[PDB]
Amino acid sequence: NVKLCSLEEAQRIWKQKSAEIYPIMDKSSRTRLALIICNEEFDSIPRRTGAEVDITGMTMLLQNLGYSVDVKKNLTASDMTTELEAFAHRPEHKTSDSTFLVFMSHGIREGICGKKHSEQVPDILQLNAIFSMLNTKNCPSLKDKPKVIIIQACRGDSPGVVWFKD
Amino acid sequence: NVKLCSLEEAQRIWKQKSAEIYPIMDKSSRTRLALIICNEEFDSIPRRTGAEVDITGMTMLLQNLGYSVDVKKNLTASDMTTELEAFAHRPEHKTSDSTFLVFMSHGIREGICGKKHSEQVPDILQLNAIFSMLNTKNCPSLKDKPKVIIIQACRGDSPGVVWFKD
Amino acid sequence: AIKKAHIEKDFIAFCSSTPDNVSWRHPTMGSVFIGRLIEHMQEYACSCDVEEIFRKVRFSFEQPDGRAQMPTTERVTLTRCFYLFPGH
Amino acid sequence: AIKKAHIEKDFIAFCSSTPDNVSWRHPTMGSVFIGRLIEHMQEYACSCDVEEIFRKVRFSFEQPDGRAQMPTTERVTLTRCFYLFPGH
């Protein structure tokens, strides 16, 4: 479902900008990986209905862009952390040129909610932790390669607006 | 000292991209403002020698880009806050198309250091506070206009590196 | 013999709203940010780098409708343009 | 009659290093990030939007020299390209 980059487009891009584009690996030998973590069911927060739609669309898109997509659902922040550590260690990243990480859940200002989150006992994965686990130390195989993080979550409970008269 | 955008360049930019560029106001009636806050002398941290060089270069550049530059030096986080509130209220912003805010100081992970900062008694201006004070509620005159924030400061004390053998 | 590497480089994050604020999800149609992102990626992956695609996504939210939100790009250390070259 | 506006929109921040990490300043020559930014603004304000200029600045820091640092763009809600059109 993705509009393709033609031979004319690709070289025009390779002309407009000289040595400032991320290199892409040969189609037949590259092993691109992406990971979707989607929390839909929660202990103390309402079910995220419609989430299956988000899962479907993002899996289809990333597969069509050349990524092998893994999908993990309904996880605590500890599970998410374990899963991201495993993802960072995947040897396929050595023969990849890039990665996508997609998180979809309830969220608050601090970060993304695990399945057990409540105001009483927080279950939160911080964006800081996500960056740490995919950095050059913890994920050397993706050194110098673009790492794209997409987050569908609230970042607090404000409507995000201010009123003015007229 | 800035390379100028020629008549040919400007319209080519206005051709390449249709209705996705920020509008700029007529040169003869616009009142662009920029603010530089530079902390050089501190109560408990070493003098930021070389800072005068940074002040000179950024003032000259922003004046040459069309901004009237105000420069405030050696301030506590409270002073910075007061100064930014005053800046946000400047009626000249109503007849401006944009603004630049430049902060240069010692910094830690939390934010930017005021002149009185120590590990004992923190004197910190948070980036969150900067965004709040220039947002649509607190600075309605810059609604829909680009607000550029530049920060020269440490963001913690790590060298920012990882080692690998070879 | 050891060599230095930057600890954090070549990241971009794209969040569904601004800090403090809500993101919206239709119970049958899915999340507006996710849907909008997919549509822009389908259209512009061929001609734009991901940073430009993300800006176009934000542009599409500019008018605060009934359920306003403003996607935000975060913690960007992309040193080059990331083009997906779909079809290659 | 009242109308809604986005609380936060049309911002871009550009910090001298990544979170947790130091930025460098030469005692006579000034701050490397500030100097590098000025040089890139002087050269590319004519042809590039500020986001592209900032990326070019980051690119210039890519090789971790003696005093490595990686400038970072933050909390971006620019919905359009900001071109400075120097000379206009």
UniProtKB/Swiss-Prot annotation, chains A, B:
The active site is at H106, C154. There is a cross-link at K3 (Glycyl lysine isopeptide (Lys-Gly) (interchain with G-Cter in ubiquitin)). It comes from the Eukaryota. Heterotetramer that consists of two anti-parallel arranged heterodimers, each one formed by a 20 kDa (Caspase-1 subunit p20) and a 10 kDa (Caspase-1 subunit p10) subunit. Can form a heterodimer with isoform epsilon which then has an inhibitory effect. This is Caspase-1 subunit p20. The chain holds residues 132 to 297 of 404 of the full protein.
